[PDB]
From a paper:
Despite observations of several configurations of the GluK2–ConA–Glu–BPAM complex, with one or two molecules of ConA bound and type I or type II ConA–LBD interfaces, all these configurations demonstrated a similar structure of the LBD–TMD region. We improved the resolution of this region by averaging the focused signal across all configurations and further refer to this LBD–TMD structure as GluK2Glu–ConA–BPAM. Compared with the agonist-unbound open-clamshell LBDs in the closed-state structure of GluK2BPAM, the individual LBDs in GluK2Glu–ConA–BPAM show Glu molecules bound, with each clamshell closed via a 20° rotation of the lower lobe D2 towards the upper lobe D1. In the context of back-to-back LBD dimers that maintain their two-fold rotational symmetry and intact D1–D1 interfaces in both GluK2BPAM and GluK2Glu–ConA–BPAM, the 20° closures of individual LBDs lead to a marked separation of the D2 lobes, exemplified by an increase in the distance between Cα atoms of S670 from 20 Å in GluK2BPAM to 30 Å in GluK2Glu–ConA–BPAM. In the context of the dimer-of-dimers arrangement, the separation of the D2 lobes results in LBD tetramer expansion. We measured the channel pore radius in GluK2Glu–ConA–BPAM and observed that the gate region became much wider than in the previously published GluK2BPAM structure. Indeed, during equilibrium molecular dynamics simulations of GluK2Glu–ConA–BPAM incorporated into a lipid bilayer and surrounded by aqueous electrolyte solution, the channel pore remained continuously hydrated, and monovalent cations freely permeated through the gate region in both directions in the absence of applied voltage. In response to Glu binding, the separation of D2 lobes in LBD dimers leads to LBD layer expansion, characterized by the substantial increase in the distance between D2 lobes of diagonal B and D subunit LBDs.
Kainate receptors, a subclass of ionotropic glutamate receptors, are tetrameric ligand-gated ion channels that mediate excitatory neurotransmission. Each KAR subunit has a multi-domain organization, including the amino-terminal domain (ATD), involved in receptor assembly and trafficking, the ligand-binding domain (LBD) that binds agonists, competitive antagonists and positive allosteric modulators (PAMs), the transmembrane domain (TMD), which forms an ion-conducting channel, and the carboxy-terminal domain, which determines surface expression, synaptic localization and interactions with intracellular proteins. Here we present cryo-electron microscopy structures of the kainate receptor GluK2 in the presence of the agonist glutamate and the positive allosteric modulators lectin concanavalin A and BPAM344. Concanavalin A and BPAM344 inhibit kainate receptor desensitization and prolong activation by acting as a spacer between the amino-terminal and ligand-binding domains and a stabilizer of the ligand-binding domain dimer interface, respectively.
Residue numbers in the entry:
A (entry chain C), B (entry chain D), C (entry chain A), D (entry chain B): 431 to 874
Amino acid sequence: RSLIVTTILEEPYVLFKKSDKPLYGNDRFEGYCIDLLRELSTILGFTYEIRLVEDGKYGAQDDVNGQWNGMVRELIDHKADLAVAPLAITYVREKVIDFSKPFMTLGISILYRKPNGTNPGVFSFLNPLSPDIWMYVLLACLGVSCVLFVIARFSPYEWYNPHPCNPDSDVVENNFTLLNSFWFGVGALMQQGSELMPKALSTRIVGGIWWFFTLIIISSYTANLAAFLTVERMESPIDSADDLAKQTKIEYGAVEDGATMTFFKKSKISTYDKMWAFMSSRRQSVLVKSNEEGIQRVLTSDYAFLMESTTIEFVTQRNCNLTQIGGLIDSKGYGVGTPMGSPYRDKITIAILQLQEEGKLHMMKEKWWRGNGCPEEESKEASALGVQNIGGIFIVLAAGLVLSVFVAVGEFLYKSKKNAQLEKRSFCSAMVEELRMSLKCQRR
Amino acid sequence: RSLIVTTILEEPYVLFKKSDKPLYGNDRFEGYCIDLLRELSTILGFTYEIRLVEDGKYGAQDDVNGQWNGMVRELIDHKADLAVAPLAITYVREKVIDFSKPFMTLGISILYRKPNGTNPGVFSFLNPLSPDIWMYVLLACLGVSCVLFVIARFSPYEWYNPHPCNPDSDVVENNFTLLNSFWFGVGALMQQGSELMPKALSTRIVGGIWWFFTLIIISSYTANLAAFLTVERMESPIDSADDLAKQTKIEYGAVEDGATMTFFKKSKISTYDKMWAFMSSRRQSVLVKSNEEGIQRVLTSDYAFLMESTTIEFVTQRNCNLTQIGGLIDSKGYGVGTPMGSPYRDKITIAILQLQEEGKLHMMKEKWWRGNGCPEEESKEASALGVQNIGGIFIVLAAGLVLSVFVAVGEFLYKSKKNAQLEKRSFCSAMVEELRMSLKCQRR
Amino acid sequence: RSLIVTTILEEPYVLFKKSDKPLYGNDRFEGYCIDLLRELSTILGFTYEIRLVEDGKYGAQDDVNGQWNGMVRELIDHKADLAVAPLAITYVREKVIDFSKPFMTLGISILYRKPNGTNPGVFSFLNPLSPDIWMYVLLACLGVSCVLFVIARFSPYEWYNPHPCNPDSDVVENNFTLLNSFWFGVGALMQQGSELMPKALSTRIVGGIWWFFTLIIISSYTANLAAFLTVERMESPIDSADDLAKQTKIEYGAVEDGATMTFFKKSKISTYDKMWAFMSSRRQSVLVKSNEEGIQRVLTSDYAFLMESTTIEFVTQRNCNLTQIGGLIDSKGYGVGTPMGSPYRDKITIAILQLQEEGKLHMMKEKWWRGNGCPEEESKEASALGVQNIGGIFIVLAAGLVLSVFVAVGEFLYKSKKNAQLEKRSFCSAMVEELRMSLKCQRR
Amino acid sequence: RSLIVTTILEEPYVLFKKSDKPLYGNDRFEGYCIDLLRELSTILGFTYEIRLVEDGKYGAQDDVNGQWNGMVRELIDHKADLAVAPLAITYVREKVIDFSKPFMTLGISILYRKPNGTNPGVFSFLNPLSPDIWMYVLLACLGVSCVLFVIARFSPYEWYNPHPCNPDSDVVENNFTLLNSFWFGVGALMQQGSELMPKALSTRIVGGIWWFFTLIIISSYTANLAAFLTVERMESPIDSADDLAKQTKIEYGAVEDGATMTFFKKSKISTYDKMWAFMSSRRQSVLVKSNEEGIQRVLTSDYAFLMESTTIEFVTQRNCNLTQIGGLIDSKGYGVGTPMGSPYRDKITIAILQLQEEGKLHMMKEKWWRGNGCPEEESKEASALGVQNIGGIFIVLAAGLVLSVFVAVGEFLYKSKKNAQLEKRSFCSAMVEELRMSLKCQRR
Ligand SMILES: N[C@@H](CCC(=O)O)C(=O)O
Ligand SMILES: N[C@@H](CCC(=O)O)C(=O)O
Ligand SMILES: N[C@@H](CCC(=O)O)C(=O)O
Ligand SMILES: N[C@@H](CCC(=O)O)C(=O)O
């Protein structure tokens, strides 16, 4: 006699094969659990014949009539002989049917979206000061530089004759112009210090306060920028089951007629009863029909789906915006289900252990979970500055040198218009001074 | 019979259970005291019928026609048999109903809004050094600039001939005037450097040790400056029960016909007698009718609510702009009331002591009073420094420059003064040096 | 009939009075619980007559004969009528005797020593670099300054004639001496920058690498010193009962025949059974005879004594090196014990509540706990630098100016010996140059 | 009868209970499997007599005279009735004894010492910027120093007459040679400033924007430099089961006559077949006789022990120089053994599933495998920067100065070369300029 194996569509355990042809018999199925059953058939030497569950459930106790549904009901009534499927091992299922040893180890955990790690774009260094403070500094170095020009002309001690060798009447100069006064202002702001130093006490206090002002601006900048380069990583506000029980902001449920909600239904510990106190209220709202709708409502809404760890291993290697929030709630396993008192309990108990010692149950999991490449993590650690987060200081350096050379032709043309008043003609005296600049020597 | 339990709906003690289908009976209710009365029924063994109180108070000895009401009249006239609810042990109640022995530790306290806005701290940058340190660096900079001037007018290697062509005779003169030695002292302190640079090793060592001094003071200042650039929110204008007594800006009150109205009514503390002389006058406006009208008038008005401690522990855990002000005024407990001597006081008295030995009173405490963690004040995550944070460096920049325009005129009037004994009293050297500003092109 | 009150020496509840006289009757007793009983006698109008417990225990079940000891055994046998004492309220005591309502609220917690907050002594700023690295920097600025002198004499381009006006033959100088080369070395180390700049490319690379070296020394100094000024507070490695159960490094016990170990003996929760799994093994080693030996063995050895919160309130306000490690394990209370079925249960139940509403039970606790002044905490928060933790940079500044002025008389005497070879006599030509230095003017 | 339970003493599963008085019987034992067998006896209902195994192994199918031993022969010959102990489900055992269904999830892994010493990181200071950034600041400093030279040989305001007395005619000359413009570029980058200061606004803007560039690059460098000055301990030379296969420096082994010796014995993985070809040869030295001789030979020798996962979880939690290397080789479970078909397998199979539903298997897991927290690697608390931390700035200081002595000779041979066409080939301008070093007092 050929056996009749019950099973159910779940990805990647059992799923239909992609082929055009009129698929006949066991042909249309592919996945982990049939490729398990391809190998159990070679060992035990029988003939399986795949035939799905009818009511589309896994198995649960309806507790009105106290009866079962799903693949569990397919076994108790002896309709189908095996249950090669992700049928988990629980306390209430073991009393009515006979499982084998596990071929996979589970854990209930939360499938939730990864939050977006919004990149600190290339103008990230302006962040440690507020955008009105950068203006207040700029109006200061436009202000204080203008105040210093007022005082330096007004103060009769900044008037010094430069002339280190015996003036003998009068060559007295006042080296602070406008263009010198901003350069003292900018030069002290950028901590470099100019070549021009105030001499009168009327201008020392302007030099003294502006040095103290740019001492605090730069020091408050550097102390704050330690915080902004050490970017505090995304910490989406669920990190455990203790967290997820206490906010009704995020919807969280399970699959209906499944071993996930059956866990919370029968549990008596405080956190997990609190989740079932939540889920029993909106029992039609949160409890989705299958795991596939458990996935999709996390993809769209603010939903945190409770499910098994081995299917999260297939989801998060496919969708690189979903993750396993939290740790394993419990531990379970996938048994090849058999009816109560079967001779195939012990022969599969052997033939799972035989496949496990020679690595066949790990060669199949690596094949059908197929990690595919996915961004693992930022790997939270010291965070050496790339081009992506300094970046814009080269942009202002590139734009600053572009803005510079037009002042250089501005200095050229204002000179070439000035000297050509009396000396030579307008266009040619520009080219005359080009002969001066292209000279490779020191000259007049 | 059924042991009729009189209870009164107050969160998080006894509240209605929400669901899809309406429930009927004892399962309508949930909370702390429902979970407690289940534990008393498990240990002792009895049926219990929740019979929520008609006249909606807890209990209060009324005046001249004195008759108890609320849950206390349910106990005196034997309409109830128990009172598992927040019926707090007070003096006047335990004379007439006969309480069991407490199951949770409360006390009268003050509920009030958290202050939103910040203490500005318009300077806030002086903070990383103590004001002992800030005055000592001036007495160092006043100190070093004097001892540098003493050495530089004593060291016979600072006396230098500038005279760059070929030094003949009768030239040498220090560049360290006493005005100049502060400018090395302040100039090195502010990290910007001076035009003065010492020669003459005895003056080098002063310049050497003042540099290493100001290397550490600036480096220690930038270390703590990350910490002290955090705003502090405003300190609430009340911090105790005495603070509400010495004001009428904040109306303060309690639940009418409860233990807290009764406590201030029969108090002989000078603080608390004034706090009832307030409440008795405007009784129609500062005695609310429930706990729920307490919190809603703290939020949607200026108000400070005198309520119990453990009910604050639920509210402030839940609502994050809302905190406890001060410490416990008195200490009292919640006790399961019984009538005037019953065969169920002593049974529950042992039964309450059993639960806190097992820890189940603490387990039920955590189960209801814990909630969302109310994300703390130490959750900074970002601080762009603004006009509130640094602030006062713009004030002292406005302070020093107005000081500088004052001393600029004072020097202008001084060179008017030494040129006065040459020509005239004021207007000679005024106008000729007021020309000096108005020239801006010609030197002398 | 006058009552016979049993009680027991515990501090500060009941203790002998300090007086020389032959103390007669109730005279010799003073403390909290007799001053409680002084006020209960005024209310209820009886005559107490203090008489101690005989066997010196509080009360516990010997569980061999199943009998009691202590004050509990004094009550059951009706020897003494009251039990006005710190006799706690537990489950096993309530079944045999009758307590009143509490007059005080307890909690079991851990009395352990405060660790010493070792002060960061005034040379604290040298800490961010290792003491061999400070030598390696000092041998660098002694090394690199010496290398620069070698190269500058060797390089034929540092030989420049200063002389800004038409040399016409030869005045070519080499301004880098020894004393100039160290000053470039020190001057770049202290970030200030000298007035002397290298000119030949042979000396630019020495100037270039030494600038990059002191860029990293100072930056690694400032980045590390943020950690050392933010002194990570003392965190003595017990912070809870979950911590204290899992190290056998610290002895922890209780008092024998007391309600502290009776809690752990009967508990079934995992952490507190683990402590009783520890304490049952060395039951004679850790379990002290009284609370006073519970105090003293913490004072001397590495012992963490489990005791009641209200006695920790008297200990830690006296001994300012002990503290309450952890939070309250449970909650209990002090009942005035009465025998099983007494008429004085309810009259004291009244007269404790009457004393509590009018604040008498808080006026007595404030008197007999008498906080006395004790250092509360460092109050862990931002830690503004006092003189105690910068400190020594003023010491090296004071010592640097002391070391300077002896170089100034060293520069004076080396000059005064040199010029007196040909010009004048040895001692007088010093005083001649004193006339030069004391001159208030510029001169030759 | 008594249901004789064969068990074998292994921590933290079944260990002797320590006390003062010696205990007798089932109370001699404690640990995980004693707490488990109590739970199986509570649920199912049976007496149990611990009868610790005589021949001290767990179980191993011996060769040609093949007879099981240890706990397995206790089950086959019905000397036991159960085997509640770490008797792990393998293929060859479950054929002959008949296991229950697992209660804890293990797998073979590698125990090995943590590497003590640090990866030195002799430079370690380049780390706060990515090597993309480090090369770009040179291409900026090579870039800006070129474009500053282009403008300064083109701007007709940089051409200045030094000539300080009174400028006549035919003088003006730039101070920006192409050698000089790098010295402004490097000089501003290293925060120290140059003797060069630009005039002529077009050159000011280059100096303006290069200053703000190097203000940010230095400030961003000092921000992350606190993070990257932490040592990393050495990466262990093994990180997997494959790494022990490709070496003979570390002897590696397992418990003789256990599941782990049996697993490599009958493995057909190319990695694991080599790992038994190793162990079989020196079987007398790399197959220890217990778990306890495993850990003691990892510590007191160079050795890497192939043992189970859950027993590593106790040891590495306890001993802090000792860690798990790699991941789980296989996956298997601990099962309560029974004989060849018993009326107690299925009773315990449901009984184990009941306990993990309630969570008591996790409660007993936490109760024994948790211990002292093994104070983590992220417990820095202090880092005085030493010769290991910064280090490489002394290397590049030794690198640049040896480079500088090379270029100093190269310039010395260059002024020998231009003076060669004056007088002689080498020794003329060599010796006369070798005099120039040897003079040190005379100028020219
Ligand atoms: N597949 C599980 C139910 C769904 C789940 O727990 O994720 C079972 O059949 O038991
Ligand atoms: N809990 C109080 C009532 C509320 C209040 O007075 O603040 C009582 O037991 O009477
Ligand atoms: N004084 C306590 C016992 C000692 C203690 O718990 O600290 C009692 O009598 O119950
Ligand atoms: N736990 C192993 C024994 C120890 C080992 O082989 O590493 C077993 O069940 O056989």
